[PDB]
Amino acid sequence: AQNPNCNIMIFHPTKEEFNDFDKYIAYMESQGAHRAGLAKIIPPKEWKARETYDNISEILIATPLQQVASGRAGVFTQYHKKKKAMTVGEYRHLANSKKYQTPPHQNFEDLERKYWKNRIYNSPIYGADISGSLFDENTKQWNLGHLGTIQDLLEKECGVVIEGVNTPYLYFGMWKTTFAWHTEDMDLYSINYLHLGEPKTWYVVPPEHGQRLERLARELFPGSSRGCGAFLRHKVALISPTVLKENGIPFNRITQEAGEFMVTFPYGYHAGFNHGFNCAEAINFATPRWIDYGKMASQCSCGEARVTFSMDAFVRILQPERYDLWKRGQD
Ligand SMILES: O=C(O)CNC(=O)C(=O)O
Ligand SMILES: [Mg+2]
Ligand code: NI
Ligand SMILES: [Zn+2]
């Protein structure tokens, strides 16, 4: 069995190997990459996402989200308070202000310490989930707006033809902006490219151990667990590495830098934080190996998780027994 310790693997494809996206994902899996839940892919030196970022400040963040924490430093939830619209140029200036900027630090490890010590005492503003792309249309390799769609994968593997679309999303971050512990919708893959700016630190639980994280989360967030049998779908709960280690939960960590891709694999729980002003692009995708994870994915039916249009068909076809309850939670 390849990668039996479930370590995060780092790949350096050549320009030739960067041509065929599906083939390279399958290659990484042949080497056991999926066992970690997360892999890093460093593009060949010849590749670029676009020529420059000199022209992005006019993008609008229609609904910036202030991430307000409750709990203790290592075990907390966050709620998203909506803020007035602002441009990327306005948000960059805000990120760089004395109130929000990254503090002085020695290295990534020192910054990670400071994040976990102090996160809860601040409320950073995240421009998340913005439909759009920063890949140049002429970038042919690993262009996250030109991937094969999940609907087409389901049609190819299963024969069924469904509605829905699959487009990328932009994320503008600042110091301490946080992504809570989650798997993807329908336990899909994700791919994330850090276009520019400061790093993103990731934590991940191997898919084979995801239920260990779920059981800890039920212990640590007991009212949320009574409310919903899949409350991590709400994407609000944070648990620190120290708390994970105290409770014996297997996990790994890695820091993504600008110019790097990360892939999350089906049912790989992940969480993390931004080091300073940055911009990432991410999208969900599927492969044949996903289908069995999609069939078994948990679902939130309590009403909180509310998701895209395109998830309807996935539930309807892969999980027809659950469909009626889940759709009630959507409506
Ligand atoms: O970058 C972020 O805030 C969150 N991204 C993801 O969870 C992802 O790419 O799957
Ligand atoms: Mg612009
Ligand atoms: Ni994710
Ligand atoms: Zn729920």
From Swiss-Prot:
Modification after translation, per record: Ubiquitinated via 'Lys-63'-linked ubiquitin chains. Deubiquitinated by USP14 with the help of TRIM14 leading to stabilization.
UniProt GO molecular function: chromatin DNA binding; damaged DNA binding; histone demethylase activity; histone H3K9 demethylase activity; histone H3K9me2/H3K9me3 demethylase activity; metal ion binding
Protein name: Lysine-specific demethylase 4D
Gene label: KDM4D
EC class of the enzyme, as a word: oxidoreductase
Major subcellular location class: nucleus
Residues the entry annotates as binding 2-oxoglutarate: 126, 192, 200, 235
EC number: 1.14.11.66
GO-annotated cellular components: blood microparticle; chromatin; nucleoplasm; nucleus; pericentric heterochromatin; site of double-strand break
Residues of the full protein shown: 11 to 341 of 523
Cofactor section: Fe(2+)
Domain JmjC, chain residue ranges per copy: 136-302
Sequence positions bearing PolyADP-ribosyl glutamic acid: 16-17
